[PDB]
Amino acid sequence: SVDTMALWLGLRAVLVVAGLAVLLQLIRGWLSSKSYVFNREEIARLAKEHSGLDYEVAFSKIIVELRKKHPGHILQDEDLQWVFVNAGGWMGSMCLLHASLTEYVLLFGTAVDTGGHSGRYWAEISDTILSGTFRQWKEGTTKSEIFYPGDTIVHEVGEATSVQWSSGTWMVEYGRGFIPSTLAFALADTIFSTQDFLTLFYTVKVYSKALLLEASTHLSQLG
Amino acid sequence: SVDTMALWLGLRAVLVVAGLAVLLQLIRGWLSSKSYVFNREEIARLAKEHSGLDYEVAFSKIIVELRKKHPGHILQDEDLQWVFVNAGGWMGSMCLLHASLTEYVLLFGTAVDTGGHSGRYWAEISDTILSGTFRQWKEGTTKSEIFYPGDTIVHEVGEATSVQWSSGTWMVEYGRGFIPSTLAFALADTIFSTQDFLTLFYTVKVYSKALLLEASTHLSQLG
Amino acid sequence: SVDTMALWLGLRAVLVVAGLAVLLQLIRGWLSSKSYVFNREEIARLAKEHSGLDYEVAFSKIIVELRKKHPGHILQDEDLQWVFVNAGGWMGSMCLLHASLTEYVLLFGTAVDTGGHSGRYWAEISDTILSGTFRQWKEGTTKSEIFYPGDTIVHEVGEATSVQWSSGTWMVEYGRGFIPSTLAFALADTIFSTQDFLTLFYTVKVYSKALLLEASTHLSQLG
């Protein structure tokens, strides 16, 4: 009975600590900046237009269109790089195109069968498929849904689903909200599982280059 | 030769530390309380009896029968909730019905293909399959075994196995032993991989509510 | 406006830390000990020659041939053991035959579908397949390659790939380079995921036994 009481008190302590953590995450999301360069419908339409072609040609055409419609906000050909992404038990790769304090645009996908935790969304993310399949298992339900090239899955803030991607699945991803908070989730398995310090290097490098591009465009627009 | 000696000394240090950890686990397990409300054969027969129905109807009927045969030991309908479980590389979901210092009962399953480490804890676990398949690859062997609805896999005290569950696999799980020791493994991937503080919140909340129900039943029986 | 610069400076700090980590990995792996007992071609042909038999008979004959051609460098039958290996999100099992500061030989494989990160280390790794399939997804590309019994996959120094093995895949693995640099990747999931301290016990025990056997052989050869 004494051990039961001690265990209940410890569980209550962990309960309130986790509640405070989630509350601080929600506060950071609420008080976040809302100056947006893109709209999610725009990225969704642009990615859905080229979903019928090969995914590499689609990547090329979408990058060209993004550079054409938003000059100074997309990285150059010299800065584009495929970087592994290990998070929540799954493994994929990304190619960052745009990333600021409130938005980011990248090409995400995997060439192998993988799946795991989607991560607690404290920012709004949208994925429009170009090839492969995307199986989502939302929280609270016992059934999953399948998504195909042309579909767009939007992840609201606070949602946590079970994601799964077949081999050769590739999509375009646009994130809106408090972008830095996602970094942790993007690097968790890189820190405590894969020990891939070079992947962490490449990730922070491309993010810093995207921030530098955004600041340079800001200065050139006001200067 | 010097580096080899240093590496061997470090390996011996890790060896003795891990041995002391295993010794602490076994000591806190053997000397744990053994006040049992249920027995694994009761839950096994209750789950196998309704294993032919749809897994949702089976869940409902099993919950009703548990509340009929053990009234003050099953959580209320207002306290039932599906909570994600990320551990050992695999991801699923649970709904807890009973949980004490020495026992716990829940409904566990996944709607997607998953698998990984079963985990090591001082607790005899029993899983009776309601739907789906369960592949178990025990330690020390090079071949696995498949289990179908109606079967009951018994994870013994020294269980190091590889588990795998196909999409739509649902089962009823009963565990007796040092239940808090099973918390760590159940939350490790939640801490270092998923960054899901809300799932940790839900887990500790439902465990605290189950312990509260058990303590309330105990006090109402002794008073 | 200002927080962009703040985040960029933080990313620069993380960048220099990760860069120093990678540079130290390179410098320590380079300029290391060059005492080699085996070579990847010998092990590759020894495994490919027996790749047509059942994998257990192949294991036995390969161990016998290794003890015949390199006596004193292979563990005894009393020291052989199958130990689970959780790393990078995948779960397999190993049987260590030889391990020193510069080389290691073991029998690896899995009885369940698994996959994940291969890991980065200054160590040339070669795997010759006896059964099952090995899908490798190298870094920087969007397509993977399948390998079959008889094939030998070379994990180059400093490379990072996505590995995937079907159920029943078994292979003979030979590592050359700075072996301790892999140890971290070999145990991360054991510490932050499986919490399996007995598997860690077994791993460090077999590594210490291999190092002790190597030291004994060296002393007997010079004494």
XYZ file of C-alpha atoms in Angstrom:
669
model
C 0.000 0.000 0.000
C 2.906 2.334 0.750
C 4.577 1.461 -2.557
C 1.264 2.050 -4.343
C 0.969 5.517 -2.787
C 4.567 6.380 -3.696
C 4.034 5.179 -7.273
C 0.843 7.231 -7.578
C 2.629 10.347 -6.304
C 5.486 9.828 -8.763
C 3.039 9.294 -11.620
C 1.252 12.516 -10.657
C 4.575 14.380 -10.650
C 5.420 13.063 -14.125
C 1.852 13.911 -15.174
C 2.094 17.569 -14.196
C 5.617 17.867 -15.649
C 4.468 16.523 -19.025
C 1.386 18.740 -18.891
C 3.554 21.809 -18.328
C 5.787 20.751 -21.228
C 2.818 20.404 -23.593
C 1.417 23.717 -22.334
C 4.701 25.504 -23.058
C 4.735 23.944 -26.532
C 1.196 25.221 -27.138
C 2.148 28.689 -25.875
C 5.170 28.817 -28.189
C 2.892 27.796 -31.051
C 0.283 30.434 -30.200
C 2.707 33.342 -29.721
C 4.645 32.353 -32.856
C 5.039 34.781 -35.737
C 2.528 34.562 -38.586
C 4.338 36.341 -41.431
C 3.991 33.883 -44.311
C 5.611 33.849 -47.741
C 3.676 30.819 -49.053
C 0.151 29.453 -48.755
C -0.473 25.734 -48.327
C -3.032 25.603 -51.151
C -0.420 27.047 -53.525
C 2.148 24.337 -52.747
C -0.591 21.692 -52.854
C -1.714 22.738 -56.341
C 1.850 23.052 -57.649
C 2.720 19.561 -56.414
C -0.549 18.016 -57.619
C -0.024 19.405 -61.130
C 3.168 17.380 -61.688
C 2.129 14.185 -59.879
C 1.624 12.258 -63.136
C 5.208 12.558 -64.397
C 8.282 10.814 -63.031
C 9.068 12.070 -59.542
C 12.498 13.406 -60.554
C 11.094 15.423 -63.468
C 8.374 16.585 -61.073
C 11.016 17.696 -58.559
C 12.865 19.614 -61.276
C 9.762 21.361 -62.623
C 8.449 22.227 -59.148
C 11.827 23.680 -58.138
C 11.933 25.735 -61.344
C 8.400 27.031 -60.753
C 9.155 27.886 -57.114
C 12.284 29.817 -58.100
C 10.281 31.560 -60.833
C 7.393 32.628 -58.584
C 9.436 33.409 -55.433
C 12.845 34.813 -56.393
C 15.296 35.019 -53.515
C 13.405 32.538 -51.317
C 14.601 29.224 -52.825
C 18.114 27.828 -52.468
C 20.393 27.670 -55.497
C 21.432 24.497 -57.305
C 24.717 24.569 -55.375
C 22.959 24.284 -51.997
C 20.528 21.459 -52.840
C 21.487 18.182 -51.172
C 19.810 14.922 -50.181
C 20.164 14.447 -46.414
C 19.002 11.376 -44.507
C 16.243 11.946 -41.944
C 15.871 9.483 -39.059
C 12.973 10.283 -36.739
C 10.312 8.435 -34.768
C 11.561 5.024 -35.894
C 11.318 5.699 -39.639
C 14.066 6.714 -42.060
C 13.800 8.944 -45.113
C 15.664 11.745 -46.878
C 14.964 15.420 -47.502
C 16.034 18.163 -49.902
C 15.402 21.555 -48.317
C 14.306 24.303 -50.719
C 13.034 27.064 -48.409
C 13.141 27.414 -44.627
C 12.615 30.419 -42.357
C 11.486 30.930 -38.764
C 7.820 30.406 -39.714
C 7.880 28.340 -42.935
C 9.839 25.625 -44.699
C 9.556 23.827 -48.044
C 11.383 20.604 -48.895
C 11.193 17.382 -50.900
C 10.737 14.335 -48.664
C 10.476 10.627 -49.353
C 12.027 7.195 -49.053
C 13.299 4.488 -51.396
C 12.633 1.682 -48.881
C 9.615 0.475 -46.935
C 9.525 2.396 -43.654
C 7.110 3.740 -41.081
C 6.697 4.895 -37.521
C 5.625 7.891 -35.451
C 4.558 11.041 -37.281
C 5.607 13.197 -34.324
C 3.502 15.532 -32.203
C 2.607 18.350 -34.593
C 3.126 21.733 -32.949
C 3.269 23.283 -36.428
C 1.065 22.799 -39.483
C 2.503 20.436 -42.107
C 1.103 19.437 -45.499
C 2.326 16.606 -47.739
C 1.311 16.218 -51.391
C 2.340 12.844 -52.807
C 4.102 12.490 -56.156
C 4.816 8.739 -56.141
C 4.309 5.756 -53.874
C 1.737 5.412 -51.111
C 1.146 7.077 -47.736
C -0.699 5.120 -45.035
C -1.878 7.283 -42.128
C -3.198 5.922 -38.821
C -4.791 8.772 -36.879
C -4.910 8.719 -33.089
C -7.968 7.324 -31.334
C -9.119 5.120 -34.228
C -8.423 1.476 -35.052
C -8.347 1.867 -38.856
C -5.898 3.450 -41.290
C -6.299 5.315 -44.573
C -4.292 5.133 -47.797
C -3.237 8.128 -49.884
C -1.986 8.090 -53.466
C -0.116 10.442 -55.847
C -2.148 13.624 -56.194
C -3.568 13.520 -52.663
C -2.558 16.044 -50.004
C -2.426 15.125 -46.309
C -2.598 18.081 -43.906
C -1.476 17.614 -40.294
C -3.176 19.921 -37.805
C -1.411 21.143 -34.678
C -1.620 18.656 -31.822
C -2.181 15.593 -34.013
C -0.052 12.457 -33.725
C -0.543 9.702 -36.301
C 1.247 6.541 -37.400
C 2.875 7.155 -40.782
C 3.991 4.486 -43.235
C 5.507 4.842 -46.704
C 6.078 2.170 -49.327
C 9.285 1.938 -51.336
C 9.772 4.703 -53.876
C 7.415 7.129 -52.126
C 8.224 10.795 -52.757
C 6.301 13.949 -51.892
C 6.564 17.720 -51.461
C 6.223 19.051 -47.912
C 5.355 22.563 -46.715
C 5.544 23.451 -43.020
C 3.899 26.443 -41.353
C 4.195 27.492 -37.720
C 7.052 27.376 -35.207
C 9.621 25.672 -37.418
C 12.561 25.341 -34.950
C 10.463 23.158 -32.620
C 10.352 20.533 -35.384
C 14.169 20.332 -35.534
C 14.333 18.303 -32.316
C 11.923 15.681 -33.648
C 13.821 15.622 -36.947
C 17.086 14.822 -35.135
C 15.931 12.624 -32.224
C 16.807 9.272 -33.801
C 19.898 10.933 -35.272
C 21.072 11.708 -31.723
C 20.055 8.596 -29.769
C 19.916 5.862 -32.431
C 21.908 6.319 -35.644
C 24.746 8.389 -34.090
C 25.110 9.984 -37.549
C 26.890 13.225 -36.699
C 27.516 14.017 -40.374
C 23.769 13.894 -41.063
C 23.189 16.294 -38.158
C 25.943 18.469 -39.644
C 24.245 18.528 -43.054
C 20.846 19.242 -41.479
C 21.975 22.224 -39.412
C 24.060 23.411 -42.379
C 21.167 23.475 -44.844
C 18.901 25.099 -42.245
C 21.489 27.811 -41.554
C 21.905 28.397 -45.292
C 18.135 28.730 -45.711
C 18.004 31.243 -42.848
C 20.906 33.154 -44.408
C 19.103 33.267 -47.760
C 15.937 34.538 -46.071
C 17.815 37.272 -44.194
C 19.673 38.292 -47.360
C 16.436 38.558 -49.346
C 14.869 40.553 -46.496
C 17.776 43.015 -46.478
C 17.826 43.315 -50.277
C 14.073 43.965 -50.297
C 14.266 46.708 -47.668
C 17.635 47.983 -48.927
C 48.442 -3.109 -26.866
C 47.740 -0.148 -24.581
C 44.539 0.774 -26.422
C 43.465 -2.878 -26.301
C 43.956 -2.931 -22.522
C 41.996 0.310 -22.115
C 39.161 -1.000 -24.297
C 39.053 -4.260 -22.333
C 38.892 -2.345 -19.043
C 36.046 -0.207 -20.380
C 34.231 -3.331 -21.554
C 34.660 -4.883 -18.101
C 33.252 -1.710 -16.533
C 30.190 -1.795 -18.794
C 29.936 -5.528 -18.057
C 29.810 -5.109 -14.282
C 27.444 -2.120 -14.527
C 25.005 -4.047 -16.732
C 25.283 -7.062 -14.438
C 24.439 -4.935 -11.406
C 21.487 -3.454 -13.305
C 20.160 -6.929 -14.146
C 20.700 -7.972 -10.524
C 18.713 -4.967 -9.288
C 15.925 -5.812 -11.740
C 15.759 -9.444 -10.603
C 15.887 -8.447 -6.921
C 13.076 -5.906 -7.259
C 11.161 -8.541 -9.227
C 11.442 -11.587 -6.966
C 10.777 -9.507 -3.839
C 7.796 -7.764 -5.452
C 4.313 -8.272 -4.050
C 2.243 -11.197 -5.330
C -1.320 -10.148 -4.476
C -3.176 -11.289 -7.598
C -6.679 -10.197 -8.566
C -6.858 -12.060 -11.886
C -5.118 -15.100 -13.333
C -3.710 -15.322 -16.845
C -5.882 -18.322 -17.743
C -9.067 -16.383 -16.939
C -8.181 -13.541 -19.318
C -6.894 -16.043 -21.885
C -10.166 -17.990 -21.927
C -12.233 -14.789 -21.934
C -10.329 -13.494 -24.966
C -10.291 -16.814 -26.842
C -14.041 -17.247 -26.292
C -14.796 -14.009 -28.176
C -11.867 -14.215 -30.612
C -14.164 -15.264 -33.470
C -16.219 -12.059 -33.465
C -15.191 -8.685 -34.847
C -12.420 -7.241 -32.701
C -14.522 -4.226 -31.678
C -17.486 -6.379 -30.635
C -14.989 -8.661 -28.893
C -13.492 -5.684 -27.041
C -16.946 -4.538 -25.926
C -18.075 -7.979 -24.752
C -14.778 -8.627 -22.948
C -15.020 -5.278 -21.143
C -18.616 -6.045 -20.139
C -17.661 -9.505 -18.862
C -14.693 -8.103 -16.921
C -16.929 -5.493 -15.287
C -19.446 -8.246 -14.497
C -16.921 -10.632 -12.912
C -14.644 -7.959 -11.381
C -16.745 -4.817 -10.915
C -14.481 -2.399 -9.036
C -11.352 -3.388 -10.961
C -12.148 -2.134 -14.493
C -11.971 1.510 -15.542
C -15.214 3.297 -16.361
C -16.272 4.093 -19.918
C -15.356 7.719 -19.189
C -11.807 6.537 -18.395
C -11.200 4.342 -21.461
C -8.893 5.812 -24.092
C -6.649 4.638 -26.924
C -3.077 5.779 -26.213
C -0.116 5.249 -28.530
C 2.735 3.012 -27.353
C 6.198 3.417 -28.900
C 8.776 0.978 -27.558
C 11.679 -1.145 -28.765
C 11.274 0.214 -32.291
C 7.628 -0.839 -32.671
C 4.502 1.307 -32.428
C 0.980 0.330 -31.411
C -1.907 1.487 -29.229
C -3.406 0.389 -25.921
C -6.586 0.771 -23.894
C -6.009 0.070 -20.197
C -8.762 -1.570 -18.128
C -6.958 -2.661 -14.946
C -3.558 -1.764 -13.514
C -2.073 -2.205 -10.045
C 1.363 -2.526 -8.451
C 1.372 -6.241 -9.337
C -1.054 -6.609 -12.268
C -2.394 -4.868 -15.353
C -4.950 -5.628 -18.072
C -5.344 -3.863 -21.407
C -6.293 -4.217 -25.064
C -3.275 -3.759 -27.337
C -2.891 -3.701 -31.096
C -1.813 -1.969 -34.274
C -3.573 -1.095 -37.523
C -0.289 -1.114 -39.490
C 2.634 -3.482 -39.919
C 5.124 -3.007 -37.094
C 7.742 -4.851 -35.089
C 10.838 -4.674 -32.920
C 12.135 -5.543 -29.462
C 9.668 -7.165 -27.069
C 11.545 -5.699 -24.108
C 13.044 -7.150 -20.939
C 11.137 -6.785 -17.678
C 10.344 -8.836 -14.579
C 6.731 -9.510 -15.546
C 5.031 -12.576 -17.031
C 2.948 -11.223 -19.914
C 0.202 -13.040 -21.813
C -1.261 -11.983 -25.165
C -4.319 -13.738 -26.594
C -4.781 -12.793 -30.248
C -8.223 -11.543 -31.281
C -7.263 -10.601 -34.851
C -4.134 -10.501 -36.975
C -0.860 -12.367 -36.655
C 1.958 -12.372 -34.091
C 5.476 -13.392 -35.138
C 7.753 -14.199 -32.192
C 11.499 -14.755 -32.647
C 12.906 -15.957 -29.326
C 16.478 -15.323 -28.205
C 19.192 -17.796 -29.143
C 17.260 -19.269 -32.085
C 17.475 -18.481 -35.796
C 13.815 -19.207 -36.633
C 10.548 -17.527 -35.661
C 7.025 -18.752 -34.945
C 3.687 -17.422 -36.193
C 0.594 -17.158 -34.001
C -2.982 -16.623 -35.169
C -6.279 -15.523 -33.543
C -7.119 -17.828 -30.655
C -3.489 -18.518 -29.753
C -1.917 -17.175 -26.558
C 1.731 -16.096 -26.517
C 3.276 -16.222 -23.036
C 6.223 -13.866 -22.580
C 8.049 -15.411 -19.624
C 10.152 -13.583 -17.041
C 13.448 -13.597 -18.940
C 11.895 -12.605 -22.260
C 14.219 -11.296 -24.963
C 12.253 -11.858 -28.174
C 11.654 -10.012 -31.434
C 7.960 -9.277 -31.938
C 6.177 -8.448 -35.172
C 2.513 -7.662 -35.813
C 0.782 -7.363 -39.173
C -1.698 -4.622 -40.023
C -4.925 -4.945 -38.066
C -3.549 -7.108 -35.248
C -5.463 -6.764 -31.970
C -5.165 -8.752 -28.748
C -5.909 -8.738 -25.014
C -2.877 -8.475 -22.728
C -2.575 -9.364 -19.034
C 0.615 -8.927 -17.038
C 1.492 -9.914 -13.480
C 4.708 -8.859 -11.779
C 6.684 -5.682 -11.147
C 4.568 -3.447 -13.393
C 6.513 -0.181 -12.774
C 9.631 -1.839 -14.217
C 7.699 -2.263 -17.478
C 7.059 1.500 -17.578
C 10.630 2.438 -18.542
C 10.738 0.228 -21.640
C 7.195 1.318 -22.494
C 8.288 4.978 -22.535
C 11.918 4.962 -23.747
C 11.039 5.460 -27.420
C 8.458 8.001 -26.253
C 11.262 10.029 -24.644
C 14.217 9.653 -27.019
C 12.537 8.944 -30.370
C 9.021 10.373 -30.715
C 9.260 13.462 -28.448
C 5.552 12.820 -27.772
C 5.025 14.447 -24.381
C 1.240 14.225 -24.815
C 1.316 10.431 -25.153
C 3.481 10.288 -22.022
C 0.871 12.497 -20.333
C -1.934 10.148 -21.401
C -0.020 7.042 -20.296
C 0.830 8.311 -16.820
C -2.708 9.703 -16.476
C -4.436 6.414 -17.282
C -2.013 4.506 -15.039
C -2.666 6.934 -12.174
C -6.424 6.614 -12.693
C -6.196 2.812 -12.684
C -4.155 2.898 -9.468
C -6.717 5.310 -8.008
C -9.575 2.952 -8.895
C -7.691 0.038 -7.327
C -7.021 2.020 -4.142
C -10.663 3.136 -3.987
C -11.878 -0.457 -4.321
C -9.369 -1.549 -1.663
C -10.533 1.148 0.764
C -14.221 0.453 0.111
C -13.621 -3.251 0.759
C -11.664 -2.661 3.976
C -14.062 0.041 5.202
C 13.971 39.686 -37.163
C 16.514 39.253 -34.347
C 15.568 35.675 -33.460
C 16.634 34.677 -36.981
C 20.187 35.788 -36.169
C 19.951 34.132 -32.745
C 18.877 30.807 -34.262
C 21.594 31.113 -36.908
C 24.243 31.543 -34.206
C 22.884 28.544 -32.301
C 22.952 26.487 -35.496
C 26.542 27.636 -36.053
C 27.472 26.375 -32.583
C 25.848 23.003 -33.297
C 27.606 23.048 -36.681
C 31.101 23.517 -35.272
C 30.444 20.885 -32.581
C 29.285 18.281 -35.112
C 32.129 19.199 -37.458
C 34.708 18.678 -34.724
C 33.065 15.343 -33.905
C 33.325 14.188 -37.528
C 36.900 15.468 -37.878
C 37.951 13.645 -34.707
C 36.288 10.472 -35.994
C 38.284 10.788 -39.220
C 41.578 11.585 -37.474
C 41.221 8.754 -34.949
C 40.141 6.219 -37.566
C 42.954 7.363 -39.826
C 46.524 7.118 -38.497
C 45.406 4.028 -36.562
C 46.784 0.516 -36.104
C 47.181 -1.450 -39.339
C 47.614 -5.002 -37.991
C 45.281 -7.176 -40.081
C 44.664 -10.911 -39.703
C 41.891 -11.417 -42.284
C 40.722 -9.740 -45.482
C 37.292 -9.187 -46.987
C 38.002 -11.308 -50.075
C 38.876 -14.396 -48.020
C 35.687 -14.145 -45.948
C 33.645 -13.265 -49.037
C 34.766 -16.353 -50.947
C 34.444 -18.561 -47.859
C 30.819 -17.451 -47.500
C 29.929 -17.441 -51.214
C 31.304 -20.982 -51.538
C 28.825 -22.199 -48.893
C 25.934 -19.907 -49.880
C 24.103 -22.779 -51.601
C 23.769 -24.954 -48.506
C 21.429 -24.479 -45.567
C 22.575 -21.449 -43.608
C 23.276 -23.410 -40.410
C 25.497 -25.957 -42.175
C 27.135 -23.028 -43.966
C 27.776 -21.322 -40.616
C 29.337 -24.500 -39.220
C 31.595 -25.105 -42.227
C 32.665 -21.448 -42.363
C 33.578 -21.515 -38.663
C 35.548 -24.735 -39.186
C 37.438 -23.302 -42.170
C 38.175 -20.085 -40.258
C 39.595 -22.035 -37.316
C 41.599 -24.173 -39.755
C 43.164 -21.284 -41.692
C 43.480 -18.878 -38.720
C 43.946 -20.818 -35.475
C 43.840 -18.912 -32.209
C 41.827 -16.047 -33.732
C 38.361 -17.664 -33.532
C 36.381 -18.165 -30.332
C 35.769 -21.672 -29.028
C 32.422 -23.453 -29.241
C 31.913 -22.671 -25.544
C 32.182 -18.934 -26.316
C 29.747 -18.804 -29.254
C 26.336 -17.278 -28.572
C 23.517 -15.601 -30.494
C 23.019 -12.082 -29.111
C 20.316 -9.706 -30.317
C 21.537 -6.519 -32.007
C 19.270 -3.457 -31.927
C 20.794 -0.508 -33.774
C 19.616 2.269 -36.071
C 16.008 1.096 -35.838
C 16.616 -2.473 -37.033
C 16.882 -5.628 -34.931
C 19.047 -8.629 -35.750
C 21.342 -11.098 -34.010
C 25.078 -11.744 -34.134
C 27.495 -14.566 -33.354
C 30.929 -13.053 -32.769
C 33.802 -15.236 -33.990
C 36.696 -12.747 -33.969
C 37.068 -9.187 -32.696
C 40.142 -7.037 -32.092
C 41.033 -3.340 -32.081
C 41.309 -3.428 -35.892
C 39.148 -6.341 -37.102
C 36.038 -8.324 -36.264
C 34.298 -11.332 -37.817
C 30.775 -12.435 -36.921
C 27.708 -14.219 -38.267
C 24.789 -11.805 -38.648
C 21.170 -12.132 -39.678
C 17.533 -11.705 -38.759
C 14.450 -13.926 -38.747
C 12.005 -11.000 -39.060
C 11.491 -8.209 -41.565
C 13.623 -5.308 -40.370
C 15.522 -2.282 -41.597
C 16.917 1.090 -40.668
C 20.117 3.100 -40.560
C 23.412 1.376 -41.334
C 25.498 3.854 -39.335
C 28.608 5.928 -40.004
C 32.019 4.852 -38.727
C 35.639 4.729 -39.856
C 35.444 1.003 -40.548
C 35.184 -0.880 -43.836
C 32.384 -3.448 -43.510
C 31.679 -6.294 -45.936
C 28.656 -8.615 -45.838
C 28.382 -11.757 -47.974
C 24.834 -13.102 -48.147
C 24.053 -16.760 -47.448
C 20.249 -16.499 -47.592
C 17.564 -13.857 -47.878
C 17.712 -10.439 -49.497
C 19.674 -7.277 -48.667
C 18.304 -3.961 -49.948
C 20.822 -1.108 -49.711
C 19.885 2.561 -50.177
C 23.081 4.587 -50.497
C 23.298 8.237 -49.504
C 22.384 10.992 -51.942
C 20.322 8.819 -54.304
C 16.611 8.085 -54.654
C 16.817 4.391 -55.617
C 17.985 1.225 -53.868
C 19.666 -1.986 -55.011
C 18.767 -5.562 -54.061
C 21.387 -8.187 -53.229
C 21.016 -11.960 -53.057
C 22.882 -15.033 -51.770
C 26.413 -14.999 -53.148
C 26.592 -11.206 -53.368
C 28.905 -9.134 -51.170
C 27.907 -5.609 -50.125
C 30.694 -3.203 -49.144
C 29.826 -0.536 -46.574
C 32.517 2.036 -47.309
C 34.320 4.180 -44.750
C 32.336 7.317 -43.977
C 29.286 6.141 -45.935
C 25.715 6.105 -44.634
C 23.067 3.845 -46.164
C 19.556 2.607 -45.423
C 19.701 -1.164 -44.945
C 16.746 -3.544 -45.097
C 16.606 -7.323 -44.677
C 13.720 -9.671 -45.418
C 12.704 -12.461 -43.056
C 15.316 -15.210 -42.970
C 18.296 -13.187 -44.225
C 21.659 -14.421 -42.935
C 25.170 -13.311 -43.822
C 28.822 -13.344 -42.765
C 30.204 -9.934 -41.800
C 33.832 -8.775 -41.679
C 34.807 -5.360 -40.314
C 38.159 -3.662 -40.886
C 39.324 -0.340 -39.467
C 38.938 1.416 -36.110
C 36.545 -1.056 -34.494
C 35.744 0.817 -31.221
C 34.230 3.655 -33.276
C 31.348 1.317 -34.159
C 30.623 0.355 -30.533
C 28.495 3.449 -29.896
C 26.233 2.723 -32.868
C 26.030 -0.909 -31.748
C 24.606 0.008 -28.331
C 22.573 3.225 -28.732
C 19.237 1.455 -29.235
C 20.165 -0.847 -26.353
C 20.423 2.197 -24.069
C 17.654 4.504 -25.341
C 15.100 2.049 -26.761
C 15.157 -1.615 -25.751
C 16.522 -1.017 -22.216
C 17.838 -4.596 -22.563
C 20.764 -4.582 -20.139
C 21.281 -8.353 -20.442
C 21.849 -8.067 -24.200
C 24.362 -5.301 -23.447
C 25.940 -7.653 -20.895
C 26.243 -10.383 -23.539
C 27.665 -7.973 -26.128
C 30.399 -6.536 -23.922
C 31.141 -10.037 -22.595
C 31.713 -11.530 -26.048
C 33.783 -8.505 -27.088
C 35.957 -8.867 -23.977
C 36.331 -12.602 -24.636
C 37.456 -11.951 -28.215
C 39.967 -9.326 -27.060
C 41.279 -11.712 -24.393
C 41.670 -14.492 -26.966
C 43.607 -12.137 -29.246
C 45.895 -11.062 -26.395
C 46.485 -14.696 -25.403
C 47.354 -15.649 -28.987
C 49.753 -12.697 -29.234
C 51.483 -13.611 -25.964
C 51.746 -17.275 -26.974
C 53.218 -16.315 -30.353
C 55.851 -13.988 -28.884
C 56.431 -16.203 -25.829
